[PDB]
Amino acid sequence: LDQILRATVEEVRAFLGTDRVKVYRFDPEGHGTVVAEARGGERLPSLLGLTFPAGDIPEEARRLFRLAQVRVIVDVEAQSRSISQPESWGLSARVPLGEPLQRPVDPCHVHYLKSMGVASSLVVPLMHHQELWGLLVSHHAEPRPYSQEELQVVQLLADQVSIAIAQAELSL
Ligand SMILES: *[C@@H](C)[C@H]1/C(=C/c2[nH]c(/C=C3N=C(/C=C4\NC(=O)C(CC)=C4C)C(C)=C\3CCC(=O)O)c(CCC(=O)O)c2C)NC(=O)[C@@H]1C
DSSP: OHHHHHHHHHHHHHHHOOSEEEEEEOOTTSEEEEEEEEESSOOSOOOTTOEEEGGGOOSHHHHHHHHTOOOEEOOGGGOOOOOOOSSOOOOOSOOOOOSOSSOOOOHHHHHHHHHTTOSEEEEEEEEETTEEEEEEEEEESOOOOOOHHHHHHHHHHHHHHHHHHHHHHHHO
């Protein structure tokens, strides 16, 4: 799995022509590791081999990854702010998306992304069945706006890998 993804991180990078793209896996204990990482003009250091703490993300945000399955961050310059809400469990049967064309994130990510010197941040969740196995993310300088039409093409690209990582769990 970790090896296979190594070729995926670079493969997708070619398509998304993103300078930096890495895959993030998750553990039940609340621990995640980077099993892949690519760099373009080497504007950022290699994070590969670094374990990220779950605390980095609560849950309400991850929920969107389950229902929204889109994950898109606008220019951190727009300074969008999104925090928690008072008693807002939101009861629904099953309505995919049904939210703004963008996903504002608390100032937590603002500095986080900016700290990486990345104005843009394209993310894509990798879920198999009803569970989440991995997470795809991309970061780079102003890569011009993104089209929804082209986004879909990649949206499926994230689904394909979902099969590779899933089929890998069996063998691995
Ligand atoms: C802020 C000081 C602290 C913090 C809190 C925090 N994070 C989020 C949301 C996200 N954080 C990430 C982080 C990553 N990007 C990556 O590339 C990686 C490695 C693969 C990570 C871990 C992401 C993707 C999100 C989701 C936002 C999006 O739309 O993409 C939140 C929001 C939760 C909410 O809804 O309240 C918060 C509060 N993260 C830190 O690192 C600090 C400790």
